[PDB]
Design a protein around this nucleic acid. Structure first.
Lengths: 93, 38, 200, 60
RNA sequence: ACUCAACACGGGGAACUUUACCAGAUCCGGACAGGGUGAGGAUUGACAGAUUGAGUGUUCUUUCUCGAUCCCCUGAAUGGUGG
RNA sequence: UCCUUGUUUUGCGCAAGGUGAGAUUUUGGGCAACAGCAGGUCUGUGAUGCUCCUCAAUGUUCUGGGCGACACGCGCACUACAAUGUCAGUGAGAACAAGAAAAACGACUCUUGUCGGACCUACUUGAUCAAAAGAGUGGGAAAACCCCGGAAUCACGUAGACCCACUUGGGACCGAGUAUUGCAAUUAUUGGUCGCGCAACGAGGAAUGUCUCGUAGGCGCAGCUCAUCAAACUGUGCCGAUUACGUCC
């Protein structure tokens, strides 16, 4: 789906990502200010697919997910965009 | 109703004073500032 | 208000749980927070403050960012600091983590526990206890006690002095339980219930 | 039950063993062990050195 | 759960929800493409017709809307109020 | 503590009385050692071993409907209502109680960084004609909420009515009507009308429960759960004794 496009952007220049685990949709972001509208389930799926490739690191508390983007994850993300960058985490600070 | 710190909806939901801590029992899941002294 | 106090409880819970899981074996004591008026300091008690910060600085801003994205906080209303806790011995949870690490490395229960006991009781602690229940056999659910110095469980006053930690280790065959207590030599009520003294 | 005999030895897998190179023999064999256990070590068995050890896996 | 440390007990005053269980349909959560199909694909979405309790778009026909993620084969997997 | 100068061989202490708000673990609760049980819990969990369910999945579904609640009148556990004259049964009026609950939706409007609607209670229409029930104005984030606190137990001879009966004592069945709640009602609704009561039951065999004081017993209110319902559970208050204060069978 064309849905997944929005979330492929959401990784980039937002640092750590956050989601809630729900079977029913809801906007995962808040901090980024992009205000994409996506169901949570779809977001989760993409997070998981590239967690399985070791690109992303998962951490979890209660019911909430928080996904950090590793050095590896950053590298991959930059290539998938084409767009080179000075590494997502370290730009923000 | 339904709960937000489990998705079980069974094993009983507290909604007293706007909190849930009985789908994860409060004896285990403390540091809400409550104490028993009496 | 009624709701203020409850919601503060919630915030502390969520925060404390997130850290105590995903940031561990740094000698994590816990956290403490207080307001400075439209900003919240949120200091992070660790023995090793370097991992908290990061040497690339990624860790501290990750943990700020996670909180912001959940609760709708922004910069200048939220901050995270590090605090150096000297004597890992006097922090229950910290000793607990190091012990957990020994056990997951597949070192002997006895030897492991003796390390904790040595460390604690050197710094001048009244007593300590390490109660490790779980597998060590099969076929039991055997419980082993190690008890040192002295410790009180009387009154409700004990709870203030003695801080406690319960953690799990996950090994082949299944779970192993771990618990650490440690009665501090320094009161947090500035109170004793024994020894009438005479000032001469 | 008069007949149900051989029940287990029907069912079991057979590798049918595995090829191996010939072993030293005479003095050469006795040499082989005396090097393994009692030399290139800080210990002599005893039970202090264990002549056979096995890897982990499963526990109950 | 079954003398006491069962039996207005499982914060259990449950009707659809909760739900294990039953009568039926559905999803991918089967992610991960490493071995294959890009355009026109097994597809995403779709009025009518049909399907069926369900004009519901799952499905099938019609025709339209299509990202090629969905889809094909293995391995792999995750989920569970199952013991 | 004092005192009885009693009891106390000296000690540890004991009893009665006294001062006194209060007589000994001050009073009522809460926490609690060591050794354990093959106790319960894998339907609390992101607490988990293995191996079952892994797609005509049984997993899973704001999916639909059904179950857990069924009725030979069957046993048991727990609860509540009565058989009434020591609220006593239908009527009226008086004085008078305490913890505790409550609010905020990215939904609208508002601006250079954003306010009011899902809580209650007040007041008035709801009687030129019922109850159930409609709606408008008004305040509160609670020591504000209209007196922050009220109608049951109780009091009453106002010269009330009934009057030793299964009734005018009790309800449980049963039919008709209507409004309220909700995503959906199939007595869900139930604070309601008005039938049936002349259906049970008259303090109830053997057996058996638990409390020595503001307790037992009697009575009511709120919280709890949550589309909606409390004979339940938890907490506060009111009226408030008889016997014993001994022994170990």
């Amino acid at each position: 789906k064309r849905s997944r496009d929005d979330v492929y952007r959401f990784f980039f220049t937002e640092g750590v990502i956050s989601c809630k685990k729900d079977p029913l949709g809801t906007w995962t972001g808040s901090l980024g200010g992009k205000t994409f509208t996506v169901p949570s389930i779809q977001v989760m799926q993409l997070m998981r697919s590239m967690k399985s490739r070791g690109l992303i690191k998962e951490q979890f508390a209660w019911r909430h997910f928080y996904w950090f983007l590793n050095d590896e994850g950053v590298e991959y993300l930059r290539k998938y965009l084409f767009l080179p960058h000075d590494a997502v985490p370290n730009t923000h600070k | 109703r339904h709960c937000v710190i489990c998705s079980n909806q069974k094993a009983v939901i507290r909604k007293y004073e706007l909190n849930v801590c009985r789908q994860c029992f409060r004896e285990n899941a403390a540091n809400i500032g409550f104490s028993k002294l009496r | 208000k009624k709701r203020m106090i409850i919601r503060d409880g919630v915030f502390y819970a969520e925060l404390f749980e997130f850290l105590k899981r995903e940031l561990a074996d740094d000698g994590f004591a816990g956290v403490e927070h207080r307001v400075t008026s439209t900003r919240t300091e949120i200091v992070i008690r660790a023995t090793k403050t370097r991992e908290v910060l990061g040497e690339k600085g990624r860790r501290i801003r990750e943990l700020t960012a996670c909180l912001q994205q959940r609760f709708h906080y922004k910069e200048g209303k939220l901050q995270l600091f590090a605090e150096r806790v000297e004597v890992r011995g006097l922090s229950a949870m910290a000793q607990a983590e190091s012990l957990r690490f020994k056990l997951l490395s597949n070192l002997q229960v006895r030897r492991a526990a003796m390390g904790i006991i040595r460390h604690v009781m050197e710094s001048g602690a009244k007593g300590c206890e390490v109660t490790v229940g779980g597998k060590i056999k099969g076929q039991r659910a055997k419980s082993m006690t190690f008890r040192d110095g002295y410790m009180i469980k009387s009154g409700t006053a004990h709870k203030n002095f003695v801080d406690v930690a319960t953690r799990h280790c996950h090994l082949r065959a299944g779970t192993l339980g771990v618990k650490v207590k440690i009665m501090l030599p320094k009161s947090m009520q500035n109170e004793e219930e024994i020894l009438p003294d005479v000032i001469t | 039950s008069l007949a149900r005999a051989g029940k287990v030895k029907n069912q079991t897998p057979k590798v049918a063993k595995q090829e191996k190179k010939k072993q030293p023999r005479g003095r050469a064999f006795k040499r082989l062990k005396y090097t393994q256990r009692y030399l290139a070590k800080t210990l002599k068995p005893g039970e202090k050195l264990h002549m056979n050890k096995q890897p982990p896996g499963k526990a109950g």
